[PDB]
Amino acid sequence: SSPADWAKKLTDAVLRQKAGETLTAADRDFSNADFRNITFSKILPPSFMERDGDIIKGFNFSNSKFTYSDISHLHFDECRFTYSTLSDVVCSNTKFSNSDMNEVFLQYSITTQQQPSFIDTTLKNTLIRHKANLSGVILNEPDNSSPPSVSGGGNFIRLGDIWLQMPLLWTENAVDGFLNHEHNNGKSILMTIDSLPDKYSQEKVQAMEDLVKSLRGGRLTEACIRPVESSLVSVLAHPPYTQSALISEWLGPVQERFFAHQCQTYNDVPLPAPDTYYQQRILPVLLDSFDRNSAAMTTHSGLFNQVILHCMTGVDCTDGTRQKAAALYEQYLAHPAVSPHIHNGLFGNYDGSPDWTTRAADNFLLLSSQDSDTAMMLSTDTLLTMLNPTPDTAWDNFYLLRAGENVSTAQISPVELFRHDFPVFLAAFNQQATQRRFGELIDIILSTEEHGELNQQFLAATNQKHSTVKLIDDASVSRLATIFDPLLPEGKLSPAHYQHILSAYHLTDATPQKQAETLFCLSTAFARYSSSAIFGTEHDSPPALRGYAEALMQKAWELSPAIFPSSEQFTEWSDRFHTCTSVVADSMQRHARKYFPSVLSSILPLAWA
């Protein structure tokens, strides 16, 4: 019959099991079924789609033809799938347990948003989408079995005994898909392969050797690999991938370029408060890079002192990461550029070294950016809030050391000091009047009177690298557009709005350049706004917020084309404005910091830096 009869024929078969009656050998045998294009929620109770619901236990769905069917949020137990076809299926957060799925097609739709799990499942010879939570799956030994079919047509790598498909060609799009698990809500082939249980380190490594050997033959350049630098190390820099010789060799240069790009970015600016992933997967690499570039500890003390601070107070930092840090720090304090400034009395445990148990000890020694003699001695509790300001954060709670000696800071303005010798805090000491100022522009785009929901939500999304709440749903399209479309007549920037933007930032009687650079930045912030990170998702992206982001960029160009890196780079940014939205958001920002970074940190949320 049709699949509709296959449909209403399992509907009331697992309900008998949910009514007591056990099912014989013949009963629980739904082989050769066809459930194509059937949204399974409609003919199923609302319990199988709820957390801690019910399990479909003891079946035999061999040869099934699911292709196009949605099995979202459903948990199977003890079931057979051998020889099925699920390619193009929707399976958001699906789960399969103690059920064997050998030799099946699983290249599901890029449509699916959350990865499905596989607790105690087997995928012997199955084609998989490179994104999957295999945190329980027990793989098999690789059989002689021939490779999966194809028609020119890409090649496949082997992950223990599963089958993964490499792209036809590592276009920048192919790269940002398979590799970047940051721009993609934590999903990627690297995160997929490492999700395997902590013993298959043999096949896990092998699988990664096979993936580097793929990229090694991409011909792709330093320029094209940068936006996945952070995502690559975060996985490949920790054991067991440290043991693998072929993986260490290739990754070396990649980590030298990572550390380098981090030294340029966060040596002058507050490294944003770290989530857990960062504490666990990043810092350890930074501690490593510092341990190999000894000199770096002093020449880039600005960043060092951050990577250390955050290490010694990271809630989820391993006792190894803490020790390395502590130890890396006793090296830094003994440096002959640092140890002179140590007022043997008040510093640390008053016995020369830091007292890492207390957060209110003078454990930190900051070096001046300009002077050889000026240094700052301050505490962990204090350095913490200076770097992550609050409305009542005091900006002078530190011992100014002018060549070993302490000096009065009464009659020394903080602003002046941070400007000259300690650049790190200035982007932060400003945040109180930078936020208000930004707020005054969001209250202008989104009227408090009528719209208040969105408002506190746009405001909210500013103090977090990412947000759970998105706006790609249909009611948030009509909603948004009714607010942005009046500000963008003929796709250009409303002359009335622009004038408000000026008065908002006191740039009214400013120089055209300082204005261009500010619009450039606002355009950068509203770029961020419509990216997977904030209100967008991996494939969809709010059309208004992108049309406003591009519109702001326009007037920037209009005011001063010198601001932009080139005539043709403006073209290409404009085009991509019409996940390719988060690739410009960074590009614009990379540019923004290099040429007018003081104008940027006055507009961008310290939390986004």
Binding site: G345, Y350, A394, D396, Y399, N406, S408, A410
Partner: protein, 154 residues
């Protein structure tokens, strides 16, 4: 907190060198940011007695100075009739957090032993000092008796 970490050490640092001038150090277990002490002048006309004293630390200590007040009436050119005293070291805009309080008190006691009518705080007594040391001492003497704390025996 930091203020208490510092004070706990500032204190034992002072309970280390038993300078015979200042005793006994009391800290109110209500605040700890408020200390009492008793200064015992070496030079006349203040031997006849001694003087109690409260040292109140702001919460933002050590990054804002303390102020010292005399809880004992004292006839002195550099000391308010209400107890207030002006020390260069603990005045804001001259204060460095590193300053050891063992030395600010040393200062106060030095200012009580040898008054400096140079930049006084009480012209009344300051003119009497420079023009009539006999008389001034004759009055400070009797005022220490009448209003001053009892001289320590040990």
């Amino acid at each position: 907190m930091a203020a208490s970490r510092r004070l706990m050490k500032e204190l034992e640092e002072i309970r280390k060198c038993g300078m015979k001038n200042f005793r006994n150090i009391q800290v109110d277990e209500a605040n700890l940011l408020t200390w009492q002490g008793l200064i015992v002048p070496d030079n006349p006309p203040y031997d006849k007695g001694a003087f109690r004293i409260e040292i109140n630390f702001p919460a933002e200590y050590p990054f804002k100075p303390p102020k010292i007040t005399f809880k004992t009436k004292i006839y002195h050119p550099n000391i308010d009739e209400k107890g207030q005293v002006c020390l260069p070291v603990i005045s804001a805009e001259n204060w460095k957090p590193a300053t050891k309080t063992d030395q600010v008190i040393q200062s106060l006691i030095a200012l009580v032993n040898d008054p400096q009518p140079e930049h006084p705080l009480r012209a009344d007594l300051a003119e009497e000092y420079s023009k009539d040391r006999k008389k001034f001492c004759k009055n400070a003497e009797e005022f220490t008796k009448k209003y001053g704390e009892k001289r320590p025996v040990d």
